[PDB]
Design a protein around this ligand. Sequence first.
Ligand SMILES: *[C@@H]1O[C@H](CO)[C@@H](O)[C@H](O)[C@H]1NC(C)=O
Lengths: 43, 49
Amino acid sequence: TQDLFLPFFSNVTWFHAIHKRFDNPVLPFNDGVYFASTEKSNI
Amino acid sequence: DSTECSNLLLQYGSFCTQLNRALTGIAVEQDKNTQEVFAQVKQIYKTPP
Ligand SMILES: *[C@@H]1O[C@H](CO)[C@@H](O)[C@H](O)[C@H]1NC(C)=O
């Protein structure tokens, strides 16, 4: 099937949440976005 | 040079793929004919003076 997909072996920008600077960028949404969250304490 | 090359290819590519497989099999067959008629004996011998 041909559709919107995440290409394999793609470079995915990884954004942290804590450094004592807390920053969350306004990332552009183009053609759908895959978002991965790997934490245990529902931040 | 179509814009929607992906859509037309996804719809109709297996037909052309099987036809190209058949024609490639024909070409390999012709190579088999050339090998059959010209490589009956593979012992290459030195050309005598
Ligand atoms: C990954 O990053 C490099 C730059 O660091 C880039 O040249 C390459 O296109 C990217 N490729 C992948 C693996 O998505």
